[PDB]
Symmetry: D3
Subunit: 228 residues, 6 copies
């Protein structure tokens, strides 16, 4: 079974995603990057509109290597109502820098609530932005004590997760994350056609917006949910 | 009268700064830059050790132009016990970018408590790092609804605030901040010799570490406090 | 009352600008940048064709921080017949560099004739080119002993002065320049629609080319002059 | 016979260079680069102190590719009293850019006085600064209608002309300049030991300062003059 | 008499070039740059399909300044069947770096076969890519002991050899190469119209592809051969 | 059992390494980078002096992403007598670029001699130079059909393999390479103290120079060999 994560642009789109059967309502800000951070008031508004039985995810940004700043930002997201706190490993260049930043984020979030989930997200197209190698995100997540290893695309030019990573390499990524006791989330201009492929490789969470649109349509969210 | 702000490296140095008569205990992390952010657990530990009649300040970083990330970081610092939240205007390039970021930080902080103080900090040596022009900091603080306009040095190579800014320009900066109803904080490898000059021009807050030292000595803090 | 400055590409366009009622005939070279310098023979030819009761302006370039070179260039422009000598503050990064360069240009020009006018020009979109903050241009002009504080756009991609600066900030810029005894010139793909706004805020000089057009039409210059 | 060119730092050093037997008194500003431009008032003061029978040289800078600005700067230097106007081919990247800039400088100077001399100067160590290839300076000078082809060093780290160019390549440079009817000037931390080598290859002008120093000593200038 | 060099994209295009009367069959890989290196198996396949009375040329790349790597690559090209080993002087910045790299390539090739020919190729548009000045290529080839001095274009945007170099400068380049006992090859989006000009100046080898197309046609190669 | 690889600077150092018990004699050129390529004549001289029962290794460089150039260079190294052909994965940015380049090198080498060994070498400190993530080298080597997965240091500032990679991460690297049927070589300012650690984790080959010195001493090589 695959969990459906939807990233609405506003409170109205969140209601649509909820009505359609989305499992996680993700709060991000595309103007600030792939995993750009939205504001504390927006995360709070989204947690307020989201039913109790569903989880809210929020990004802290396509982050530079600033452990202190990002640890404080993760506190801001958690306090604001995020159940999943997601870090875009953008400015971190290698395994060690990424583990150092993520360890501090993990401590910061768990200190707010031990039940909150930390997501280490790498970019499938990291080479286009100089970000940390995506294939080492499962080890970064394992060694930092994260709960979820994720991939998304950094540049939103229409090129998908599958244009940057082969099915075999992605299947290896998922297997490796699972071997470390982690869940695996995959996104990057995902289309309905990609859903059975992601389900097949054992992906735990799929992230979408475009596939549900143009604005989010509950009928299309329902269609995606059925495919999961 | 000038308020003395001291930036201790640890809880032990904070106790030393408190014992010596420091008015504000500033929590920063030099490893992450001039106004590098420390961790939520450190801000909390410092507020716990600091007497209730003294204020705690915390930096959110030498920030990139990421309003959402920085607004969340400001929440993290405020929740952790910071009374003053300081933003290093590093990655912001002009007046508009700086106002947009600071307006969002002001909302994030004032939403928690209208009594918490927001400091917009520019770099006296901004040109060495590509940061926003320091002389427009008072207008950025005015237009973003900040409480304090501050200058510090970006590069810690021993060059002081006075090596980058003339007494006349600094006196103009202080007068302009006061004309907009703001307080003015000045720092940048400040030495004991600089204190009467800063007092003379009407500076509200002086920031130090090196002058109180290599470790923070309460006797040296006392000496600086007497000069204020 | 607003003075109309027109920047013709050749002697024929200058005649058109003169016939249409332009007050200042500005000699620049767009091939070398926003305020690119034209040649001594062109400034001389333009002053020869321009009636004695009108003033000739000439740019010395989108200048790097080379006080000696620019002071010599200001001499070249003045000797060639320029009444206004305009410096594009491009390569100067801060207040101090800009004041040092402009003080030397002011000496070079005032030594020739105290009646010749020195214009310190900043870019409304300075952040796109790394140039000195435009909002400190009035203080640079005050402290260097310039006569006019000006703004123009650095990149000629069709984005105007009003796309980079708000009416309120521009009104503050004009008021500040006037408070220091300076005149204020504003340009940056100015359109006919912008003229009443610029007049309203107390702008002394408006610079155009595109609005008077693709070639300078005397009828269009007349229309702009009537609006001033 | 080799002509001795000396670059004094002030009017007092110029008097010393004159007394020692220097043939050309060169006015440059090392703070602005290898061939950094001094101010119009300094060139004028040097021409005023220099006897009628000696020539004054002045640089217009380590120039960017800005023909208009540099043509105006050459006018400033010529008007100020420079007999030789020297252009440092720094920001020009190839033959065509260098010829375009130099042709305009040549027109500008000759329009002031047909008897004035234009010097195209390349850097022996151009690769260290990205400047135009020094070995093509004789063709640039020929094709732009310059009078002198020159080489100097861009970075003043103590590395000489001979550390960057072999005697054979320099002899070829001199022969080529002579074949085009040009004079050849050579400089670049020249020492007394280098003088017979430069004379041997047929160099017309040698540029010094250090070899005459520490301040210029007329006795050492006399010694260098005897070696020429 | 001018020799016709054609650069086919595959074995089939090579056969067309051969049938049409091409004298040299050049093996390059546009994906890796202007003079990008193809693979050993491709050079071998081309040498096999080419009649023994015709020569095969192969590039080793738009090379960085890595003498050892490039000397080994030249061995690879020679062993693979290349008669002409062409080096694109891309990453070399000046005369000395280019002579050092080329001397090592010459030794590497000569140690395989004394009869194999070494081409030192510069870019007519070197300024666009930061490559060594094209006008010094004849001296680099002379001093490194190369057999051929060549120019091509670095960027394949449709701008030709004649857009970057004047006929006079090219005639000087050819004369200089001949004076050093070298052959001269010229290429850079050459069109049929350029052929009589190149023949007139004494060019030994002309390089084409586009002028023979769209795929290479033997009829078009025949037409170009007649013009040679 | 660990194999001892020694990188001598000359033929005399190679003899010392051989006499001391070195198993692989590695030919590199530090002037061109960490894994800078030496010349064909040097590889040939080393293969000649080395007893036939020992293997010779040679680097093709800290390579840019130029498959054709590098494939030709690998042919040059193989033809010259290298048994191991080592590629420094420097300019390749990700898994895909590295696999593409390495697959071509593997084909080029195999076409010369099936018994020759291809080493895919990554940098333990890749982040300092922008090179491909070292932790994905075992997958690159597996997928390109290489025989050996190696790590070395890019910058020779005295910082070792152990300063950049933890013993656990290195043990994982070795286990992963072995799981894909590869051998693992580790180097990077290795000291005698590091040898038991490398042996413990199952490293197949250890690379040294400094630990055997100052020039290579057979007594010191013998000591290192005993530790292996």
């Amino acid at each position: 079974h695959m969990i459906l994560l939807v990233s609405p642009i506003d409170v109205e789109e969140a209601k649509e995603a909820i009505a359609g059967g989305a499992d996680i309502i993700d709060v991000k800000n595309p103007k600030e990057g792939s995993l750009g951070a939205n504001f504390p008031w927006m995360i709070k508004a989204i947690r307020e509109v989201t039913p109790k039985d569903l989880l809210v995810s929020a990004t802290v940004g396509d982050v530079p290597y600033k452990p202190g700043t990002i640890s404080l930002a993760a506190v801001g997201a958690a306090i604001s109502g995020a159940d999943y706190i997601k870090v875009g490993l953008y400015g971190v260049k290698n395994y060690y820098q990424a583990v150092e930043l993520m360890k501090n984020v993990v401590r910061a979030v768990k200190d707010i609530d031990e039940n909150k989930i930390v997501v280490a997200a790498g970019y499938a197209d990291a080479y286009r932005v100089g970000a940390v190698e995506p294939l080492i995100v499962p080890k970064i997540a394992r060694d930092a004590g994260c709960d979820v290893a994720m991939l998304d695309t950094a540049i939103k030019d229409g090129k998908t997760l599958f244009d940057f990573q082969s099915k075999e390499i992605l299947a290896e990524f998922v297997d490796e994350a699972h071997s470390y006791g982690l869940k695996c989330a995959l996104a990057g201009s995902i289309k309905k056609e990609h859903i059975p492929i992601l389900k097949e490789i054992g992906t735990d969470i799929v992230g979408v917006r475009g596939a549900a649109c143009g604005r989010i349509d509950r009928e299309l969210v329902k269609e995606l949910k059925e495919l999961c």
